[PDB]
Amino acid sequence: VAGGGVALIRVASKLADLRGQNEDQNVGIKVALRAMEAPLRQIVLNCGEKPSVVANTVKGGDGNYGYNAATEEYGNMIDMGILDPTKVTRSALQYAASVAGLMITTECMVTDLP
Amino acid sequence: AAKDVKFGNDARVKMLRGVNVLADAVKVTLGPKGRNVVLDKSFGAPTITKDGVSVAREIELEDKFENMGAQMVKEVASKANDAAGDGTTTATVLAQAIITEGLKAVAAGMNPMDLKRGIDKAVTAAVEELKALSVPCSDSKAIAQVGTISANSDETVGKLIAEAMDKVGKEGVITVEDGTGLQDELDVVEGMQFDRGYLSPYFINKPETGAVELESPFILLADKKISNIREMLPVLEAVAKAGKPLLIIAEDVEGEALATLVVNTMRGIVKVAAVKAPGFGDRRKAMLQDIATLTGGTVISEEIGMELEKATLEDLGQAKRVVINKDTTTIIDGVGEEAAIQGRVAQIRQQIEEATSDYDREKLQERVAKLAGGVAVIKVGAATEVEMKEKKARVEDALHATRAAVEEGVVAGGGVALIRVASKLADLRGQNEDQNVGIKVALRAMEAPLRQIVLNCGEKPSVVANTVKGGDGNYGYNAATEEYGNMIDMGILDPTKVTRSALQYAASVAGLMITTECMVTDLP
Amino acid sequence: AAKDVKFGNDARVKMLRGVNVLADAVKVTLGPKGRNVVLDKSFGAPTITKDGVSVAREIELEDKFENMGAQMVKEVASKANDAAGDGTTTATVLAQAIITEGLKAVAAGMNPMDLKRGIDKAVTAAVEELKALSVPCSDSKAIAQVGTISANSDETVGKLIAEAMDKVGKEGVITVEDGTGLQDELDVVEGMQFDRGYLSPYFINKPETGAVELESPFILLADKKISNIREMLPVLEAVAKAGKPLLIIAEDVEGEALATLVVNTMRGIVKVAAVKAPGFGDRRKAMLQDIATLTGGTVISEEIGMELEKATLEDLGQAKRVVINKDTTTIIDGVGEEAAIQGRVAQIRQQIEEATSDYDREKLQERVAKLAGGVAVIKVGAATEVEMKEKKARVEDALHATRAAVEEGVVAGGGVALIRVASKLADLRGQNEDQNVGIKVALRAMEAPLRQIVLNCGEKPSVVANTVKGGDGNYGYNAATEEYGNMIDMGILDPTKVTRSALQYAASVAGLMITTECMVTDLP
Amino acid sequence: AAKDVKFGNDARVKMLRGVNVLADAVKVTLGPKGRNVVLDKSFGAPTITKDGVSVAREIELEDKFENMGAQMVKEVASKANDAAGDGTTTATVLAQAIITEGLKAVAAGMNPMDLKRGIDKAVTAAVEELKALSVPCSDSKAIAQVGTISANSDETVGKLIAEAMDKVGKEGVITVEDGTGLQDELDVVEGMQFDRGYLSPYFINKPETGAVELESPFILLADKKISNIREMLPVLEAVAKAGKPLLIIAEDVEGEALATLVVNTMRGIVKVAAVKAPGFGDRRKAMLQDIATLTGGTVISEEIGMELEKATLEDLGQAKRVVINKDTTTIIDGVGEEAAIQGRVAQIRQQIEEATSDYDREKLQERVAKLAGGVAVIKVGAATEVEMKEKKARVEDALHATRAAVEEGVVAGGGVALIRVASKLADLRGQNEDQNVGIKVALRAMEAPLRQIVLNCGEKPSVVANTVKGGDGNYGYNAATEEYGNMIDMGILDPTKVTRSALQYAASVAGLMITTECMVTDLP
């Protein structure tokens, strides 16, 4: 799928309608979606860019329309040669979400005294 | 002397941090199930109130910067209350909203000057989209209804207001006084009202309304500036006698004279208030005369060798009661001869028969109006002095809401009017992505009032907001009975003029702060 | 008493550190998208302004040294505003630029006295290279156009100014007052104006413009110095009567007398202002007379046994209104007999027919000019007192910019005039590498104004600057519409006199500070 | 374990603060009026040196972060000395320069990744602009001249080098040993040299040059990795006998075996050094043979059931002397039969007559070269052992500078070569303003070396720099005689290869640090 973190940002803009059983769960959704923009927004940021402009632009298009941050030029990511094995993007996300979940649901920590 | 200066981001969080204290303290009194705020008072027992206006008056932080922030939204938010007689708490919770997301967007790197224009546009639109939602209100059948709703449903009050507006017109002048017992009284008396406020607070003696008030006072009409009390002594100490308070109307009062008076008002040595003559130029000189005629007595203009010394007690004017606001002076019942005044209007009309212009005509038939219209004076009556002072309070408030609906109509209350107007502009866009955010920020903010009212009621803000955004028109949510429906029909409304004001004003300051880069203040 | 002394490098960073606070606080206003600066005010609601002049007036740091630094660029930067009625913020952001790189170069080991000369050269050149870029402005078709652009495009104002200059000449005297209603009035009255300022601030009562102002005052003309009030009592308390303010014109007022008066002006016990007689020598004595004739009344010169005691009330002068600036006294409408004044000019002309010199001739036909030219008085009119006081403000400002264009022409605004002048001197060199740096520093600095205006607009300073440096003439960048082109044609200009001023002044102080090795101040 | 992490700006000043200690301590040695640096030594009398290399070896700060910074420029700066035999101090003062203004620009808000590219460009250019300024050096008339200048003008040394290069070619192999008395000796012996360094310092025993050195040692040629000493015991203790040091050449030595040996070298129980066989693949296997033939003895490859146990003493190789550097092994005088070796070259040439490729051909005629070229061995002679050990030092250094000129030519010394190259690129620009700064920073930096040499001489850096930037070519400033002119002619030059190196390397680390955002290190 499209690299440079766009694959995620696209998938996110496609689920704006998604909802859950109650307002909390909705936030739960909105939090995860908001988060999926991090990778891209950081790549951009590392490049001394304007994260918001570039993110909104990518969220505007459809498909693998991304932003080759290497040449500051938008277009199709796969054609430009910027991609990531779907398996890694899926993994990174599922895993991140796993630990994120666990910690958000932690109430107690036990450890050794210094 | 030495100052402290903060810049950009640093200086902004300080302001926000400050306004948050203001907004959060004042917004818990918002909405039917609003909570109490306990205002400790110097010596005595605290004050428990739910009046946002009172809570804001006291708020004032310690950090010089945070204060400015809070002090800034207060200056404007009160501007809304002074225009429609209500909607301060509203304008405040609004400004907090705009400001919060706005400064959030700035940190997000976006441009300030654009977020601003984007906001002012989203508002400019909401205001027109609001005039359309506005249900008219012209037949005295409606006046009597709005005045009623604006007084916990006392069909008496509504009627009273109406009977009055009927005697002097919607543009007339209506005054409220204490009754002489059970049963209400109403009638018009030779009076007048111009747009001039007190030349300084302090004179105020009815902080309940924030205005001055004088019984059977004297009116000093002098065409000239006054900065030296030495010209008052002759005809000022002669007023300490008779104990009759004195109203000075002159082109203006400055420094020495003014300060000297602002002093004596607290030191009880004579209670006098003075304000600027109305208008300017030759017209001011003429209007000064109108007043004199209407209140009996004469004007003291240098133009004819008259000095404030060669002025006895009869040269002075006199009426049965005056009332000064932050920007309004109104003379009630003038000693003026009901025959001489009729003669002055004679001239003014034979001066229109020589109106070699259009502007000149209006301004003249605008003067006969004041001088010939008179003033309606409602005297609230009740069973006991308490009930009465209370009712006179409700009437005074209903008389305010009424005039705001008669001017611009009314709209759904409970904060729905705004939330509707907002859902109607989701398509709205601007010149660039920043300006678009500017728009989306303002729209998002317009939900604050409702979402808070709901929140104060231990509800689910989101559910209730979406539901209201679903319907159309004045389909709202009477938070008092947890039941949706038409707001106007349920009796939950706000004079369009106050909702428009609260918004325009909140947006004003929000904009200014989002576009501030530097703050300068004193060192602690 | 005990002092603190800092030296060389140590003492310099302190100044810079100080001027930076001044410059940064004031420059965020620069250009179309300028931001607001919130100035906290003792008691009341803060003041939100974008006026660089107001922001600077308040800045004053705590560190005794840093202050001097900031206080130093303010003394000069204001000198520019007093000369062309504008360009203070500019001169400031300029001095920051020069100073920053300059002290940077000093640390770099280079010589200070050379960096200076290198800078003064780069400037001396920029000023001539600026007179050339200057588009003339002499036909009243242009006056009426500049006056217009200098007032948000009110073609009325421009016209008004022109009609005035047409009556008294480009060198005439134009005064602005309040109107007597709708419609403007203009006409010339027997008046005069000399180059003398108030003998002390405080007298000021219109801090809005920083000047004095007296209505139908009295003018005391005494040829002699005055340091003892004991000579005023007879003819000063006699002025407390009639309440008519008093203007004292004497060779000079010192200590006891002066202080004693500066006191009473705040204590309201009589509002009087006094200034030094014009010129010096025998001419001063003669001009004093001119004034007397023009304002009716007589001069009190010791030369003939006259004492300030044997002076009644008619011996005194009198006019309908006076106005004192930091360096200008102007008498408007003199009681003087329109027949006696005509007789004085008789002498002065029969005294030129005996002009055994050239200098002597000019100075005389220079007096008839003042005494015979009179003064033009514009009375701004508007619909309401508010609109009017506002318009009168715009006219007063346009009347200033106009006179600065009539004298030296106008050039492209938005800071391009400077950036152009800079790109034209890239070849310029001096006596040694240091002086060359001196040049390059000043040139680099002349881009600050534009680069800031652009920056305030969330732009890319570099792109925009290079582009402007690419073209030629008044090819600029209207930052208000993000579109390049001819600045004069787009209506974005600045009187050459102000741009020249801002630059010359900024360079002055920048030079002085770069050449400072020691600072002495009080111990905290 | 627990670590300390610093970020961005915070972490950068730490590095800089660190590298500054390094640079300032090392640069005060620069050029002829270079000062001394006193290096305290554990027990004994301090060491007074002007050798920047030695001063840097010792520098190592306490603050974990600052250290890294200093430790980072050292890693690279030494890389320059290892490539051209000189130019470390240079590369350091350079890196300080780039880094200082660079991080200064970052704080100025500019982009790091751009400053970098701008710098690398400015360099990429300076390198080509340097190859052009480079005066060739091919005729043995020049070699003998450069070798001379690179030895305080001992025309003997220069000649000696030349006579040698003449026998083995510019690409030959030249060795320097102690002489057998007065008079120098030179001759070629059956030897060889490959690009493999010691498998670990410590083995080093001539820290004066930082290399190993063995007299009439044994050479162990085994095609295989070795990590277990248990395979050495049989043929290692048999080497403790005869006391003849041992050189192990195997595919590689790891852990247990390696460590075990690095131990014994300090514990005197046998002095052996080992290095990796040359090349890789089948060629490595073949080259291993070449060595064996050349040094008499055989290879022990598992491929044919041979074990490091069934290996006597004659199976082992032997030569008259070896020398290992950080990346170079060189065998001098092999026991190998001058008749058998001639037979091996027989095969290698009849293997080229079957060269079904081009690559394959070069790599083969590259082997005969090593195996048939032999090694030139210069034996410095002098009057006394002292004079001699000293001269042998000079020759060893001149032999290095010479080879760096023979490869890439020579350019003006005293830091002018760089300052010239810099003034030639003033026009150079990049894709954006940041990159431009990147360029300007690198150029400004290239003046450091000269400006320091001058400074060490109590001169006026600026004057002298501008003067040199005025002229063209190798017009420099012999700081030794305060007289300008042609540097090459005056005898002040540097092998182009070292100047190019110092620059490329300095720029490398400078870049990396300017682009660092995070540092992680151990907690104190």
- Which CATH number fits the domain that encloses residue D397? 3.30.260.10
| Closest-CA residue of chain C to D469 | C433
Q: Which contiguous run of DSSP H or E holds residue D384?
A: none
Q: Is B426 on the interface with A (CB under 8 A)?
A: no
* Cβ contacts from B onto C, under 8 A: 104
Asked if residue B465 and residue B436 are part of one domain, the reply reads: yes
Residue D330 is labelled as binding a ligand: no
Q: Which contiguous run of DSSP H or E holds residue D105?
A: helix D88-107
**Domain of residue D518, residue span:** 1-134+410-524
Q: Distance between alpha carbon B22 and the CA centroid of its chain, in Å?
A: 20
d(CA D309, CA D232): 8
Partners of D111 on chain A (C-beta within 8 Å) are: 48
> Phi and psi (nearest 5°) for C363?
-55, -25
| Token code pair at residue D36 | 């001394």
Comparing C-alpha atoms, which of B417, B424, B422, B400 is closest to residue B496? B417
Strands D174-178 and D375-380 turn out to be parallel
> Phi and psi (nearest 5°) for B194?
-120, 165
Helix axes B112-133 and B416-423, enclosed angle (nearest 10): 110
d(CA C170, CA C167): 9
Contact C332, C175 (CB under 8 A): yes
Instruction: Quote the minimal CA–CA distance from B102 to chain A in Å.
Output: 14
What are the DSSP calls for B384-398, one per residue? SHHHHHHHHHHHHHH
Asked if residue C419 and residue C402 are part of one domain, the reply reads: no
D interface test, pick of C110, C433, C447 with most D CB neighbours within 10 Å: C433
Interface of C with D in 438-477 (CB under 8 A): 462
Q: Name chain A's partners: 3 or more CB pairs within 8 A.
A: B, D
Comparing C-alpha atoms, which of C59, D71, A9 is closest to residue B523? C59
Amino acid symbol at B173:
V
> Phi and psi (nearest 5°) for C251?
-55, -25
Asked if residue D92 and residue D1 are part of one domain, the reply reads: yes
Asked if A51's CB is within 8 angstroms of B460's CB, the reply is no
- C412: which strand partners? C493
Q: Residue B23: how many CA atoms within 13 Å on its side-chain side?
A: 26
d(CA B115, CA B129): 21
Comparing C-alpha atoms, which of D508, D446, D399, D520 is closest to residue D116? D508
* Cβ contacts from A onto D, under 8 A: 5
Amino acid symbol at A66:
G
Residue B32 is labelled as binding a ligand: yes
- C194: which strand partners? C329
Asked if residue B393 and residue B315 are part of one domain, the reply reads: no
Residue A69 is labelled as binding a ligand: yes
d(CA C357, CA D61): 84
Residue C286 is labelled as binding a ligand: no
Partners of D114 on chain A (C-beta within 8 Å) are: 48
Q: Is B200 on the interface with C (CB under 8 A)?
A: no
| Closest-CA residue of chain D to C437 | D462
Asked if residue B205 and residue B159 are part of one domain, the reply reads: no
Contact B96, B19 (CB under 8 A): yes
Contact B25, B59 (CB under 8 A): yes
**Taking the C-alpha atoms of C57, C59, C63 and C65 in order, what is their torsion angle to the nearest 10 degrees?**
-50
Partners of A46 on chain D (C-beta within 8 Å) are: 113
d(CA D41, CA D57): 13
Comparing C-alpha atoms, which of B229, B353, B252, B343 is closest to residue B289? B343
Give the domain-ending residue among B312, B341, B371: B371
Determination technique for this entry: X-ray
Partners of B112 on chain C (C-beta within 8 Å) are: 35, 458
Comparing C-alpha atoms, which of C458, C425, C451 is closest to residue C439? C425
| Token code pair at residue B502 | 């609260």
Residue D290 is labelled as binding a ligand: no
Asked if residue C347 and residue C273 are part of one domain, the reply reads: yes
Residue with tokens 């008092």: B480
d(CA C314, CA D521): 93
Residue with tokens 């009332």: B323
Q: Do chains B and D touch (3 or more CB pairs under 8 A)?
A: no
- C221: which strand partners? C249
**Taking the C-alpha atoms of D7, D12, D17 and D23 in order, what is their torsion angle to the nearest 10 degrees?**
140
Asked if D113's CB is within 8 angstroms of A47's CB, the reply is yes
Amino acid symbol at B464:
V
- B378: which strand partners? B176, B186
Angle at CA C185, nearest 5°, toward C183 and C188? 175
d(CA C342, CA C363): 19
Q: How far apart are the first and last CA of chain A?
A: 47
Instruction: Quote the minimal CA–CA distance from D489 to chain C in Å.
Output: 28
Amino acid symbol at B166:
D
**C377 by DSSP, 3-state: which?**
strand
- Helix-then-strand count for chain B, H and E: 20, 19
- D484: which strand partners? D477
Sorted by sequence, the CB contacts under 8 Å of residue D414 that are 6+ apart come out as D31, D450, D453, D476, D477, D478, D479, D487, D492
Contact B275, B246 (CB under 8 A): no
Domain total of chain C: 3
Q: Is B109 on the interface with C (CB under 8 A)?
A: no
Angle at CA B104, nearest 5°, toward B98 and B109? 125
Comparing C-alpha atoms, which of B475, B418, B424 is closest to residue B97? B418
C interface test, pick of D433, D437, D463 with most C CB neighbours within 10 Å: D433
**Taking the C-alpha atoms of D34, D35, D40 and D45 in order, what is their torsion angle to the nearest 10 degrees?**
100
| Token code pair at residue B110 | 């976006």
Residue B87 is labelled as binding a ligand: yes
Amino acid symbol at D55:
V
Q: What are the helix (H) ranges across B176-248?
A: 234-237
- Helix-then-strand count for chain A, H and E: 6, 2
> Exposure of C43 by Cβ count < 10 A (0-12 exposed, 13-18 middle, 19+ buried)?
exposed
Give the domain-ending residue among B388, B409, B430: B409
Strands C36-39 and C47-49 turn out to be antiparallel
Q: Residue D142: how many CA atoms within 13 Å on its side-chain side?
A: 19
- B273: which strand partners? B247
Q: Is C105 on the interface with D (CB under 8 A)?
A: no
Residue with tokens 């820290």: D207
Backbone dihedral region for residue B173 (phi beyond 0: left; psi -120 to 50: alpha; all else: beta): beta
Q: Name chain D's partners: 3 or more CB pairs within 8 A.
A: A, C
Comparing C-alpha atoms, which of D139, D252, D233, D246 is closest to residue D203? D246
Q: Is D120 on the interface with A (CB under 8 A)?
A: no
Q: How many residues does chain B have?
A: 524
| Token code pair at residue C353 | 């027919």
Residue B414 is labelled as binding a ligand: yes
C interface test, pick of B518, B519, B521 with most C CB neighbours within 10 Å: B518
Asked if residue B185 and residue B208 are part of one domain, the reply reads: no
**Taking the C-alpha atoms of C355, C360, C362 and C367 in order, what is their torsion angle to the nearest 10 degrees?**
-100
Asked if D462's CB is within 8 angstroms of C110's CB, the reply is yes
Q: What are the helix (H) ranges across C178-231?
A: none
| Token code pair at residue C524 | 């905290």
Contact D477, D454 (CB under 8 A): yes
Residue B480 is labelled as binding a ligand: yes
Amino acid symbol at A84:
D
- Cα–Cα distances (Å) from C282 to C288, C298, C299, C434, in that order, read 10, 17, 14, 51
Partners of C433 on chain D (C-beta within 8 Å) are: 462-463, 466
Of the candidates B71, B256, B517, the beta carbon closest to that of C35 is on: B517
Sorted by sequence, the CB contacts under 8 Å of residue C21 that are 6+ apart come out as B5, C59, C61, C66, C70
Asked if residue C356 and residue C293 are part of one domain, the reply reads: yes
Asked if D463's CB is within 8 angstroms of C109's CB, the reply is no
Q: Do chains C and B touch (3 or more CB pairs under 8 A)?
A: yes
Asked if B462's CB is within 8 angstroms of A23's CB, the reply is yes
Resolution in A: 3.3
Angle at CA B511, nearest 5°, toward B508 and B515? 140
- Indicate which CATH number applies to the domain containing B285: 3.50.7.10
Instruction: Quote the minimal CA–CA distance from C433 to chain D in Å.
Output: 7
d(CA C140, CA C165): 8
Q: Name chain B's partners: 3 or more CB pairs within 8 A.
A: A, C
d(CA D477, CA D267): 52
Q: What are the helix (H) ranges across D30-63?
A: 52-58
Asked if residue C294 and residue C147 are part of one domain, the reply reads: no
Asked if B109's CB is within 8 angstroms of A51's CB, the reply is yes
Asked if residue D475 and residue D440 are part of one domain, the reply reads: yes
| Token code pair at residue D179 | 């002489």
Q: Is A28 on the interface with B (CB under 8 A)?
A: no
**Taking the C-alpha atoms of C215, C216, C217 and C220 in order, what is their torsion angle to the nearest 10 degrees?**
150
Q: Residue C36: how many CA atoms within 13 Å on its side-chain side?
A: 21
Backbone dihedral region for residue D196 (phi beyond 0: left; psi -120 to 50: alpha; all else: beta): beta
Asked if residue B464 and residue B320 are part of one domain, the reply reads: no
d(CA B520, CA B2): 10
Q: Is A48 on the interface with D (CB under 8 A)?
A: yes
Asked if residue C403 and residue C311 are part of one domain, the reply reads: no
Strands D214-215 and D317-324 turn out to be antiparallel
Q: How many CB atoms are closer than 10 A to CB C263?
A: 11
Contact C369, C193 (CB under 8 A): no
Residue with tokens 């972490």: D11
Partners of C467 on chain D (C-beta within 8 Å) are: none
Q: Name chain C's partners: 3 or more CB pairs within 8 A.
A: B, D
Q: Do chains C and A touch (3 or more CB pairs under 8 A)?
A: no
Q: Which contiguous run of DSSP H or E holds residue B317?
A: strand B317-324
Q: Do chains D and C touch (3 or more CB pairs under 8 A)?
A: yes
Partners of B463 on chain A (C-beta within 8 Å) are: 23
**D375 by DSSP, 3-state: which?**
strand
| Closest-CA residue of chain A to B106 | A52
Instruction: Quote the minimal CA–CA distance from A39 to chain B in Å.
Output: 16
Asked if A23's CB is within 8 angstroms of B463's CB, the reply is yes
Q: Is C36 on the interface with D (CB under 8 A)?
A: no
- Cα–Cα distances (Å) from C241 to B309, C235, D123, D218, D497, in that order, read 11, 10, 86, 125, 98
Instruction: Quote the minimal CA–CA distance from C209 to chain B in Å.
Output: 18
Asked if C36's CB is within 8 angstroms of B517's CB, the reply is yes
Q: What is the DSSP letter of B206?
A: B
Positive/negative CA dihedral, B361, B362, B366, B369: positive
